[PDB]
Each structure stands twice: as structure tokens, then as C-alpha cells.
């Protein structure tokens, strides 16, 4: 349960690309960009759409559905760039695919950073 709340974890843990919920992140972790795992940095806008991953939580042994909403409308954060591809699939499985910009439907599609939002159990 504590491993389900990134706000309680040490920041170095959650800002690492190996943090369990980042398993299909391809981008800059918002938590290193003035945001948190589930909040956009100031002045960047959440994406209403995303790709989704299923990631294993090694702490509680359960598998979870994670939604990779981006924060948009600012230029590239540049920090904590991660590239993990667990269960990621090509564009013919579009909402499993992370080589596209999930800011694509935002008022401004400039890609700033990527978040890992817990939807629930897989």
C-alpha cells in the first residue's frame, strides 16, 4: 500500500527510471520537472489521452494498470529522461504505443514531461 503512494517514497526512488510504475515511460519524468508523479509542473497541461502500461509492483506482488498522461504546452523538460518498454506495442495497438506524442490532442501539443498515473489492478 505504501508502494502505491509515490508521494510517501524517497524522491530518489520515484525519480529513477526503474521505479516500478515507470515501466512504459518514454520521456522525461514530471517528478524531476517541478511536478510530481501525478501532478504537472506549473504551467503545463495534462493530456486528456494517453498510452497505458501494465507494470508489476515488486513490493506487493500485484500487477497494475498505469496511464502515461503527458504534460504539455511547454518545451522539453530535459530531466530524468526514461525509456522503458515493458509490454509496449506498435501503432496498430495504438493505446499501448509510446513512440507517439500523447500531447497530440492538447491545445498545444509541445511535449514537456510524462507522468505515471495509477488506474488500478490489471
Amino acid at each position: 500500500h505504501i508502494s502505491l503512494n509515490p508521494d510517501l517514497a524517497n524522491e530518489d526512488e520515484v525519480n529513477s527510471c526503474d521505479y516500478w510504475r515507470h515501466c512504459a515511460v518514454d520521456g522525461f519524468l514530471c517528478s524531476c520537472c517541478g511536478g510530481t508523479t501525478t501532478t504537472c509542473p506549473p504551467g503545463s497541461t495534462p493530456s486528456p489521452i494517453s498510452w497505458i502500461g501494465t507494470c508489476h509492483n515488486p513490493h506487493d506482488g500485484k500487477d497494475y494498470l498505469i496511464s502515461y498522461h503527458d504534460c504539455c504546452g511547454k518545451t522539453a523538460c530535459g530531466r530524468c529522461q526514461c525509456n522503458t518498454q515493458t509490454r509496449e506495442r506498435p501503432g496498430y495497438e495504438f493505446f499501448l504505443h509510446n513512440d507517439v506524442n500523447w500531447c497530440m490532442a492538447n491545445e498545444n501539443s509541445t511535449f514537456h514531461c510524462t507522468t505515471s498515473v495509477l488506474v488500478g489492478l490489471a
Binding site: 515501466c23 489521452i49 504546452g73 511547454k74 518545451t75 522539453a76 530535459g78 529522461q81 525509456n83 522503458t84 518498454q85 515493458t86 509490454r87 509496449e88 506495442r89 506498435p90 501503432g91 496498430y92 495497438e93 495504438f94 493505446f95 513512440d99 507517439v100 506524442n101 500531447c103 497530440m104 490532442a105 498545444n108 501539443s109 509541445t110 511535449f111
Partner: protein, 357 residues
């Protein structure tokens, strides 16, 4: 001495390659770097704003780019465009307006293509609903939106037909689209299922022959689509792997990760060991060279951490690209021979292309 402009690219067209640099850390300043593959010389560049895509016109006279602008970059009205640039002067000529849904994503070849006859540009859209856009080059107009391609992804032109192309669909098959003289869809067909989307997903990058395309899978299998005939016939899998390969868990990996030398039927693939879930975009530990007729590997050479490649048929050449550096290989014999490496051709490129000859 007086400084002058108006100059053309110094090297002959046959020497030219196009490295599409995403500049991902500063993605609003993507660009195409033009290089001479014979000596590694930088010949010039074309700025392509946010996440540019590029191709060269089939006739070699023009460069086409696709990009997105906003009036104030991070705010203001969006403009998705195709641009036409002169290939020799590297100057802007014409903007073609697109609906604001052109694909924003990494530079797989299949997102931005043209018909064999060169009359239409064929591009991938996502709103996130997918469709394929058709642009009439001569008219400078977007003319058709192929919404029938919804749920499919990427454009594979058919080199044996003037204005036909295929796309890979979420059913594991291929949708063929045949354009009329005006760029509207005249006819379409769906193949039978080629691969299992859940059990053996393919990479989108085709190893493209004149009348057939081969695809490799996450687990090292090979599928084919033959379009010599009236309907697309599909086949596979066959495995790239022998028993020793399997025991070491060799699988393919990369982006634009395959190529075909048409004369010989040799297929080139980036491979790495210790494959498992999540390793499909790993750099090449090796390049494997497969004979597509005998279905046997005929060479394996160091991968140089390459991610993408392209082939030139006439000169019997392969380029590989690790994100920053371009390797030039002679592929006239089964074993490729490394000719040179062009260091610092880009900061973050996943696509290189030859000038058509």
C-alpha cells in the same frame, strides 16, 4: 572577397544521404542534416520545427518535409504542413496545409511516404483516431482522408503499382488502398490475418521487395505479404533463429530495423541476445543477414549499437544509425564490409535515407 549565397549542394545527388535529427532534447528545433556518404562531409540542412519528418521526391528534385508550427510555438494557432524544398538549393518553395492531426512521433519511414508514381504524398494521421492523409503534390493540396484505415498504422507503398499502398491493422492483417488519378480512394482490400497481434506482434518496418514485403516479429519470426497478384497473400511465421540462437534468446530490436537487398533477397536485421519483454527497441548487438529464399542466416556482424538502417539497391550499400553516428556498409557480398563511420551526424536521429538514383 565578398560573401555570397544562392549556392547549390556541392556534392552530386548520388552521394547524398538525409539524417532526420529529432533533436528530442529540443524537439521544436528538429532538422534534416544532409551528408555525403562517400567522405562524411556535411552538405547542408533543412530546419523542420517540431518533430519534423522527411522524404526525398522519387525524381530526386525535391525534399518533402512534414511538421507542426504554432503562432507562438507553445501557444497560439496550430499549423500542420507539408513543405516542398528544392533538393539542390535546400530552399523552401511551397507549403501545403494539412488538417491538424498529422502524426507526432518518432521517424519510422512508414509515417511519411509517397506513391510509386510520385504524384501523391501519403502520411499517417492520429487524432488519436488513425487515418491516412493523401496530398496531391502537383496541386499542393490535401485531397483525401482515408478513414477506412482507422485502427491501422503506417504506409507501405507497393513498388509494383503507381498509387497503391498498404497499412498494418489491429486485426493482424493488411489493408491495401488503391488511389484514383485524383487521389481519392478508388478501391481497397483487406488481406487475411498475417500475424497474431497478441502472441507474435510484428515490427512495422517492412523489408520491402518490388512485389512483396517481409516483417520480423518481437520473438524473431518472419512474416510476408505478397502483392504481385490482385489480392495480398500472407505467410509465416518462419524463425530467424537456429537452436543455439534460441538458447541465447536472440531477438530483433530497433526502430527502422530491417532492410532488403532486392537482387539477392538478403534481409538485414538488428539483433540482440537475452531478449525478453521490453527489449524490442534495444540497440543491435549484431546485424544478421538472412537469405529469404533458403530462410537461413548467411552472415552475422557486430551491430555497433545501431537502431535504424536503410539500403541502396544500385550501389549495394547499407547505412546504419545509432542515434548519432552513421555507418556505411558494402553489401555486395553476403558478409557486409564496413567502409566508414560518420561521427556526430545527429544528436537524436532514428532515420537515415539515401537520395534516389
Amino acid at each position: 572577397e565578398v560573401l555570397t549565397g544562392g549556392h547549390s549542394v556541392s556534392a552530386p545527388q548520388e552521394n547524398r544521404i538525409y539524417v532526420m535529427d529529432s533533436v528530442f532534447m529540443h524537439l521544436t528545433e528538429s532538422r534534416v542534416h544532409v551528408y555525403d556518404y562517400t567522405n562524411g562531409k556535411f552538405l547542408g540542412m533543412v530546419p523542420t520545427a517540431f518533430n519534423g519528418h522527411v522524404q526525398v521526391s522519387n525524381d530526386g528534385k525535391k525534399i518533402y518535409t512534414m511538421t507542426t508550427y504554432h503562432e507562438r510555438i507553445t501557444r497560439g494557432k496550430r499549423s500542420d504542413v507539408v513543405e516542398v524544398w528544392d533538393a539542390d538549393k535546400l530552399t523552401f518553395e511551397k507549403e501545403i496545409s494539412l488538417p491538424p492531426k498529422r502524426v507526432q512521433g518518432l521517424n519510422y519511414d512508414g509515417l511519411f511516404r509517397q506513391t510509386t508514381d510520385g504524384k501523391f504524398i501519403v502520411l499517417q494521421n492520429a487524432s488519436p483516431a488513425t487515418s491516412i492523409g493523401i496530398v496531391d503534390v502537383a496541386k499542393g493540396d490535401y485531397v483525401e482522408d482515408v478513414t477506412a484505415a482507422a485502427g491501422c498504422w503506417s504506409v507501405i507503398p507497393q513498388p509494383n503499382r503507381p498509387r497503391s499502398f498498404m497499412t498494418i491493422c489491429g486485426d493482424g492483417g493488411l489493408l491495401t488502398i488503391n488511389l484514383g488519378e485524383d487521389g481519392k480512394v478508388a478501391s481497397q482490400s483487406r488481406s487475411k490475418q498475417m500475424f497474431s497481434v497478441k502472441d507474435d506482434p510484428i515490427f512495422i518496418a517492412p523489408a520491402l521487395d518490388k512485389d512483396k514485403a517481409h516483417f520480423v516479429s518481437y520473438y524473431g519470426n518472419v512474416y510476408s505479404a505478397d502483392f504481385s497478384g490482385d489480392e495480398v497473400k500472407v505467410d509465416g511465421p518462419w524463425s530467424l533463429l537456429n537452436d543455439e540462437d534460441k538458447a541465447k534468446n536472440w531477438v530483433p530490436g530497433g526502430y527502422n530495423l530491417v532492410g532488403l537487398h532486392r537482387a539477392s533477397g538478403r534481409m538485414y536485421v538488428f539483433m540482440h541476445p537475452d531478449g525478453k519483454e521490453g527489449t524490442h527497441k534495444f540497440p543491435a548487438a549484431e546485424i544478421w543477414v538472412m537469405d529469404t529464399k533458403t530462410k537461413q542466416r548467411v552472415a552475422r556482424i557486430p551491430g555497433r549499437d545501431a537502431l535504424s538502417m536503410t539500403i541502396d539497391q544500385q550501389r549495394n550499400l547499407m547505412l546504419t544509425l545509432d542515434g548519432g553516428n552513421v555507418n556505411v556498409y558494402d553489401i555486395s557480398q553476403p558478409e557486409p564490409k564496413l567502409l566508414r563511420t560518420i561521427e556526430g551526424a545527429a544528436e537524436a536521429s532514428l532515420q537515415v535515407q539515401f537520395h534516389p538514383v
